[PDB]
């Protein structure tokens, strides 16, 4: 489908065009300030995939553990019967913990993997 | 044994120079094209950090000039120009009974005037400063501006009240605060610390004298770039504040003419009651005491021994030769010459000022500009926070002097550096890339 | 001044489990990679396993991988060492010991800098 | 700690919060210009990690050999008494030299990692 | 050899110095937009890349066939007896079936990782 | 031949009274006005 | 000798030369120059 197409499909159906979304980011003083802006954000979102251990990447798996308290629905739940509007609502107000918890994981990962290919 | 490794985010920087934005929470200097500030600013305190910070070389100091420039300008730019008012003035005294100061001081002056048509003119009588009005040769009269320059006239909408404005760091880049009591001014600081914006600067617009600026914590501080070379000015800051007591008493009124197709003119109109001279006061045992903290502060970079005397400006124009202030949205000049007439070996005090509409700021010439009259009697009080000095055997006489507004910004950004952060570098560990 | 005090167990029988500890002194805990070594009763020294300075990385002799857990605390400065199974074969002293690694930015070892006295574990 | 916290701390320890000051570099034509300016050299940062074979990483290790030339101080000595600061002053004048050795070593790396994949 | 030195190289002598071109592509309204569009233009280069999974590297080898209807030529004509240029132009028609190629295998490949990854 | 993508099972609420777009809108307009007539005569003689 | 098309011929033809001509001018007269204010901050310049 387009851009868009998916958002009222389900979780587990939208994830297969994350691609088509990814691609419409970076496709007169004020236009050109909108343009750097857009610019700065999409650096920020990058940056801040960066420093989570997902570089390239469009689905990455990470080591930080679902604490139920965020949403406490079933997995079939969640991925057959929720669009991602919903979702990005049930938990929007815990997205800085998780994002927090990234950062420190990452950090714990990177230090973990320094220390471990000094042994000769 | 040792690797290279790189390290992304490490916390360095170098001295740099970049573009600092406005952030402010009509008005001149208050401007739609600034940031709102932040409600709860950070301070990040530098554990055994001791930068080198030099107060005479900091850029930030020309950013600030040009960019209260600009907005001046922005300010002056979309209002009535007055190019009509090159013309002959016949002008006689208007109080030829005074038996005071103001007397022959305020002119009363007809001329003629265009009107919203232009096919017809109109006669005026209007009130003119002795300052602003120079003689050809009832006698003829022109004035100063029309030897160099068109003044264009402030709108009466906008205010000249100072309001604080904070430079903030662009990213990339961050601001370090020395924080160091009895700062020199130059040399390391040993409390630096990183703020994301500096504190809110008033840009007050003054000479010989800083007003509204920041105090001293511990001491009078003497600073510049050099104390030898008596080229330099000395800013000297207090570490406690001199009220200043300024008035123009007059119930001065405010006439308005049509000039134009949209365009009016507004003067100084009749005076309901006495014609009284504008004058400040300031406090005799203060001022004495504040200056003989600053002799003996003085006497540090020159000697126990020696005789410091003070002494009024010399040379110039009203523009250096005495303090000048923009009070109420007036503009005043005073002589202040009683306040430095001493000689320092090892209640009220009244200073006359004159108002003065044709204004030449900036130190800039062919840009003039008129501050219309203001309605009712004119009152403010002023803090003196620092004082200009200049030097000119045993004996040193010290001068106002002063003029330069970078030296009234100074005194205010002397405790911040602009770096840029460089967060990428090498180092050996024993990590190797398998 | 640098001392390790091992607080282990007594006999337990195969398919049981035993815990043992180490408390430290005399150094900076966190600043170490510590390890476990084994002497049978009647034979030489084995190394069984080993945790760096932060808890995060472990390694064990094959004999273990699916019976030995190791865990450190750095605020307690104690190690701890939670056996399963603890067959007829694991009998000996357990001693605690500092140094076998060094997490990068550390000189390094590669051997064991300070040694304890010793819990005896029998089966 | 904040921003620039660490500038005081160790090498050993300051390298700790490198995720702190990383954040902190994304986030009126002169100031439309300082943005576009700070975006570049942004971009070239990344670039320049990137081209080391160092991309999604805070901290990278390399197969550079480090020279004793370039500083001949025990590794205690750079890691526990020294700060970032006096650590970029000492070997200010070996960059370019070390940049030019890792983009020499990735490139090495880059070409014979295509050929060993093609032994079927 | 210096930028672009390469040009008249063959393709196999060419590779050698990507590296020298990547590093160039980075280092008064009208010069500050053409400045914005070249930032725009590299980042849409990059998430290209990013998309097909090749992030941080200069060669990328990827697992669609060549279908030699885009060129039948012998793999040592190609890359011993050609430039660059020219090679650009012999494919010119085919680039976008091939990206297009490109981004459906990096989707398959990232969901068949994440699938795997979830065999406890 | 611009592209338009129909969205299922999506209902977003709008509200045409608060939509920034009109203020734009607005805007251009009288920056195009004032552009085209800003370079032409100003007639000052008229005022007779 | 280039031109964007020489049959046609309304291009200019551009004629490169491998060497130079050196060409003399003058304005011998000792000119002066005197001015005059007109305006508030204005001033006009003319021959002498
Ligand atoms: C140093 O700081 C002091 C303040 O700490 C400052 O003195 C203050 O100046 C302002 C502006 O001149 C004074 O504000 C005026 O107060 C009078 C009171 O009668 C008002 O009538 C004035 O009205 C104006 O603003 C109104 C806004 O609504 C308008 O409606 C009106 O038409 C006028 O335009 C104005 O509010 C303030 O009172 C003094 N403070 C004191 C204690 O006197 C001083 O000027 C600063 N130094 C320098 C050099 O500027
Ligand atoms: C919308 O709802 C229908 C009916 O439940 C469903 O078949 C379809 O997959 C949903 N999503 C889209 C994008 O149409
Ligand atoms: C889950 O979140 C709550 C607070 O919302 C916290 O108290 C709890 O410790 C969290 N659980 C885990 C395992 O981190
Ligand atoms: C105003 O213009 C008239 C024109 O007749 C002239 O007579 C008169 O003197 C002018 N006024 C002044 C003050 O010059
Ligand atoms: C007019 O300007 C000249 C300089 O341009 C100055 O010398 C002269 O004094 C000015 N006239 C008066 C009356 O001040
Ligand atoms: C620097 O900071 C310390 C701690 O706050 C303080 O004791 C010291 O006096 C400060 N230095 C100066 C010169 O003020
Ligand atoms: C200001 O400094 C002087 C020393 O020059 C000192 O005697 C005085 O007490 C100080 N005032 C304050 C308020 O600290
Ligand atoms: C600051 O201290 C230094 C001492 O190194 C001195 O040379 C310099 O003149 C001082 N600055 C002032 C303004 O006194
Ligand atoms: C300060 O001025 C004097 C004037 O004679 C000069 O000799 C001295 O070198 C100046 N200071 C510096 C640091 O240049
Ligand atoms: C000035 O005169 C006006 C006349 O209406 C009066 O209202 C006002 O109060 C007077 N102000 C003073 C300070 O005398
Ligand atoms: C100026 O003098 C004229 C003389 O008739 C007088 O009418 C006028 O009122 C005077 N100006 C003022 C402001 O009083
Ligand atoms: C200035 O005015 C204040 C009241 O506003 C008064 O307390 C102070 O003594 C005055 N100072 C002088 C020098 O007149
Ligand atoms: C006041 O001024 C005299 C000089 O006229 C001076 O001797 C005296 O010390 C001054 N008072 C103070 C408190 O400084
Ligand atoms: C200030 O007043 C004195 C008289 O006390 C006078 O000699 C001096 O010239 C005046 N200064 C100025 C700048 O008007
Ligand atoms: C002037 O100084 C006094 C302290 O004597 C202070 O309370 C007041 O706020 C100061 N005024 C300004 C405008 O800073
Ligand atoms: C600063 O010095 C003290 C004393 O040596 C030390 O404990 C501290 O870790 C150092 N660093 C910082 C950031 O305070
Ligand atoms: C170390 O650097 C020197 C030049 O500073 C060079 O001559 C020497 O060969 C280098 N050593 C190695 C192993 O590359
Ligand atoms: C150009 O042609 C010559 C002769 O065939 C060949 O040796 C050379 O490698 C080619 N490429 C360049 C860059 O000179
Ligand atoms: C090769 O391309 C042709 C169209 O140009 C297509 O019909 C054919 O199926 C392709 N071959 C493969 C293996 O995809
Ligand atoms: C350049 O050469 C071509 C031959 O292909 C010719 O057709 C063309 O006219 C020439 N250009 C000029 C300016 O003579
Ligand atoms: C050059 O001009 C002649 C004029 O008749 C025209 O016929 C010819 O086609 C032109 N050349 C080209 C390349 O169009
Ligand atoms: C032109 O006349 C002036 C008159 O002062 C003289 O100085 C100058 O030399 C003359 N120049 C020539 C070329 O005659
Ligand atoms: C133009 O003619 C007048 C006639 O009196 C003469 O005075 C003047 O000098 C002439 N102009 C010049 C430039 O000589």
């Known amino acids: 489908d387009g851009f868009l197409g998916a958002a009222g499909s389900t979780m587990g159906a939208a994830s297969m065009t994350l691609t088509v979304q990814a691609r419409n980011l970076l496709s007169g003083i004020k236009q050109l300030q909108a343009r750097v802006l857009a610019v700065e954000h999409y650096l920020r979102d990058q940056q801040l995939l960066g420093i989570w251990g997902c570089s390239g990447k469009l689905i990455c798996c990470t080591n930080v553990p679902w604490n139920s308290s965020w949403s406490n629905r079933n997995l079939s739940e969640i991925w057959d019967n929720m669009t991602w509007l919903q979702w990005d609502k049930e938990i929007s107000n815990y997205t800085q913990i998780i994002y927090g918890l990234l950062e420190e994981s990452q950090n714990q990962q990177e230090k973990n993997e320094q220390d471990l290919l000094a042994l000769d | 044994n040792l690797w290279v490794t790189v390290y992304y985010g490490v916390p360095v920087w170098k001295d740099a120079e970049t573009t600092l934005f406005c952030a402010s929470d009509h008005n001149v200097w208050a401007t739609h094209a600034c940031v709102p500030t932040d409600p709860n600013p950070q301070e990040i305190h530098l554990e055994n950090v001791t930068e080198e910070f030099n107060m005479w070389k900091n850029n930030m100091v020309e950013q600030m000039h040009e960019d209260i420039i600009s907005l001046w300008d922005q300010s002056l730019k979309p209002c009535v120009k007055l190019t009509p008012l090159c013309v002959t003035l016949q002008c006689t005294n208007y109080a030829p009974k005074l038996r005071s100061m103001m007397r022959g001081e305020i002119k009363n002056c007809s001329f003629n005037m265009t009107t919203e048509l232009r096919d017809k003119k109109q006669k005026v009588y209007s009130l003119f400063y002795r300052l602003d009005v120079v003689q050809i040769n009832n006698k003829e009269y022109r004035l100063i501006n029309c030897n160099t320059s068109a003044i264009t006239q402030a709108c009466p909408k906008v205010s000249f009240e100072p309001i604080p404005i904070h430079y903030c760091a662009p990213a990339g880049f961050a601001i370090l605060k020395c924080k160091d009591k009895k700062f020199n001014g130059t040399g390391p600081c040993q409390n630096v610390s990183t703020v994301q914006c500096t504190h809110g600067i008033k840009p007050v617009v003054s000479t010989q004298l800083l007003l509204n600026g920041s105090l001293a914590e511990e001491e009078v501080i003497i600073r510049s770039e050099n104390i030898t070379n008596n080229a330099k000015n000395i800013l000297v800051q207090l570490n406690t504040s001199v009220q200043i007591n300024c008035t123009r008493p007059s119930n001065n009124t405010v006439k308005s003419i049509r000039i134009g197709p949209g365009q009016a003119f507004y003067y100084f109109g009749d005076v309901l009651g006495h014609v009284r001279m504008a004058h400040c006061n300031i406090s005799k045992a203060t001022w004495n005491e504040t200056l003989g903290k600053v002799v003996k502060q003085l006497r540090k970079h020159f000697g126990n021994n020696t005789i410091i005397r003070f002494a009024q400006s010399s040379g110039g124009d009203l523009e250096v030769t005495t303090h000048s202030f923009n009070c109420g949205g007036e503009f005043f000049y005073c002589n202040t010459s009683g306040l430095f007439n001493s000689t320092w070996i090892s209640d009220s005090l009244i200073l006359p000022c004159w108002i003065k509409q044709i204004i030449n700021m900036w130190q800039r010439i062919g840009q003039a500009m008129y501050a219309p009259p203001i309605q009712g009697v004119i009152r403010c009080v002023s803090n003196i926070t620092g004082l200009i000095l200049t030097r000119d055997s045993t004996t040193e006489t010290f001068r106002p002097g002063g003029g330069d507004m970078r030296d009234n910004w100074r005194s205010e950004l002397y405790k911040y550096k602009v770096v840029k952060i460089e967060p990428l570098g090498v180092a050996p560990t024993r990590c190797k890339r398998r | 001044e640098v001392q390790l005090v091992e607080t282990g167990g007594g006999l337990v029988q195969p398919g049981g489990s035993l815990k043992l500890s180490c408390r430290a002194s005399g150094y900076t805990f966190s600043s170490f990679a510590m390890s476990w070594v084994r002497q049978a009763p009647g034979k030489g020294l084995e190394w069984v396993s080993l945790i760096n300075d932060r808890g995060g990385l472990t390694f064990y002799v094959d004999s273990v991988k699916g019976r030995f857990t190791i865990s450190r605390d750095n605020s307690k400065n104690t190690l701890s060492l939670q056996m399963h199974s603890l067959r007829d074969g694991d009998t000996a002293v357990y001693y605690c010991?500092?140094?076998?690694?060094?997490?990068?930015?550390?000189?390094?070892?590669?051997?064991?800098?300070?040694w304890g006295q010793g819990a005896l574990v029998t089966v | 700690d904040g921003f620039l916290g660490a500038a005081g701390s160790t090498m050993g320890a300051a390298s700790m919060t490198l995720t702190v000051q990383a954040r902190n570099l994304l986030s009126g034509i002169k100031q439309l210009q300082a943005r576009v300016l700070a975006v570049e050299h942004y971009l070239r940062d990344q670039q320049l990690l990137g081209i080391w074979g160092c991309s999604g990483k805070l901290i990278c290790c390399t197969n550079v050999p480090w020279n004793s030339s370039w500083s001949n101080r025990n590794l205690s000595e750079i890691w526990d008494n020294m700060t970032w600061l006096q650590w970029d002053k000492e070997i200010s004048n070996y960059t370019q030299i070390i940049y030019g050795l890792l983009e020499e070593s990735q490139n090495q790396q880059e070409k014979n990692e295509q050929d060993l994949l093609a032994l079927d | 050899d210096g930028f672009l030195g390469a040009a008249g190289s063959t393709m196999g002598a060419a590779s050698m110095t990507l590296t020298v071109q990547a590093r160039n592509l980075l280092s008064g309204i009208k010069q500050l937009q053409a400045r914005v569009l070249a930032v725009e233009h590299y980042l849409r280069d990059q998430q290209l890349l990013g998309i097909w999974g090749c992030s941080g590297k200069l060669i990328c080898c990827t697992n669609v066939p060549w279908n030699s209807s885009w060129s039948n030529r012998n793999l040592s004509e190609i890359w011993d007896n050609m430039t660059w240029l020219q090679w650009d132009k012999e494919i010119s028609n085919y680039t976008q079936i091939i990206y297009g190629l490109l981004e459906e295998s990096q989707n398959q490949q990232e969901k068949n990782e994440q699938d795997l990854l979830a065999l406890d | 031949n611009p592209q338009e993508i129909h969205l299922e099972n999506v209902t977003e609420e709008f509200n045409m009274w608060k939509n920034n777009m009109v203020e734009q809108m607005h805007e251009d307009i009288i920056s195009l006005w004032d552009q085209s007539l800003k370079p032409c005569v100003k007639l000052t003689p008229l005022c007779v | 000798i280039r031109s964007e098309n020489i049959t046609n011929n309304a291009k200019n033809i551009l004629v490169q030369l491998n060497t130079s001509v050196q060409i003399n001018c003058t304005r011998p007269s000792n000119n002066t120059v005197k001015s005059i204010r007109i305006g508030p901050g204005q001033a006009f310049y003319y021959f002498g």
């Open positions: 010991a500092t140094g076998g690694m060094s997490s990068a930015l550390q000189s390094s070892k590669y051997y064991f800098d300070f």
